[PDB]
Design a protein around this ligand. Sequence first.
Ligand SMILES: Nc1nc(Nc2ccc(S(N)(=O)=O)cc2)sc1C(=O)Nc1cccc(F)c1
Length: 294
Amino acid sequence: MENFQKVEKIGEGTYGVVYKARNKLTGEVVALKKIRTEGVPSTAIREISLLKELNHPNIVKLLDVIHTENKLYLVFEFLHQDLKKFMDASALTGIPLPLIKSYLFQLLQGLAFCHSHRVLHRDLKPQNLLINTEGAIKLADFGLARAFGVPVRTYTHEVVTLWYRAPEILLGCKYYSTAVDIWSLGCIFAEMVTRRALFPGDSEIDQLFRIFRTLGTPDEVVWPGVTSMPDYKPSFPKWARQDFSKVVPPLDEDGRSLLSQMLHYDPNKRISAKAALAHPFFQDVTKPVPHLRL
Ligand SMILES: Nc1nc(Nc2ccc(S(N)(=O)=O)cc2)sc1C(=O)Nc1cccc(F)c1
């Protein structure tokens, strides 16, 4: 708070506010997140610790961790812009396919790395995917649902986005697998391509039903065990599955086949980040530099 001079407020994470700040000593510009209170569960520091020791080009680097008076500060390397802003800025023309491919490929490397270190992101969304002028994209905000909790909002009455939530989460599964991050990334990939959220739900049930309306109401054939899930209701409407050709035009067939594997209902059939990296869609992958307006 003192060694840092809050330059500007950057956002409202689901755990606290993020500020752009400068280290009045080292002159470095960083992203500082203030964590939301009555003791600060130490159990989380462990989670945090593993994070600082995590080092990969596609994961935002956690520089310093500061615990002081129910207040937990996380100091991250500062990235230039988030993917939400970039997508909005690119809405008239769309992000060029080679860049979409580059970003997806890089995020999959980020996830493959996290997942191999047994770390789950849990809340991937455009707002927490950060980019720089050099063409990189990194994963920020690693949820920390176990390292903290999922009350009702972000921290001060704010509409949490459910658009990228995997169906198994929406159906009440208490234990998520790495597959939930692949689902979220698939939703994001579709969005980059079409310039419209794939499943823009405004409530958990609306989110679930929009998924059902597009991918078809799941049943025991495509998703063994689904009818026994916590929030599953035999009374759910039975919608037929729509063709991907209609869901994500003009994504070429390789892109659509990859997307379909990222959006399989069954967490166990859903493609892994490692396997996704070997998908033919990335045969011609390159690393373009984006036109960023900072
Ligand atoms: N590292 C890092 N850099 C950031 N910069 C940034 C600059 C401009 C825009 S923008 N709306 O495009 O102009 C957006 C972001 S944000 C962030 C970060 O790490 N957030 C974060 C989020 C949630 C939890 C958490 F712990 C950290």
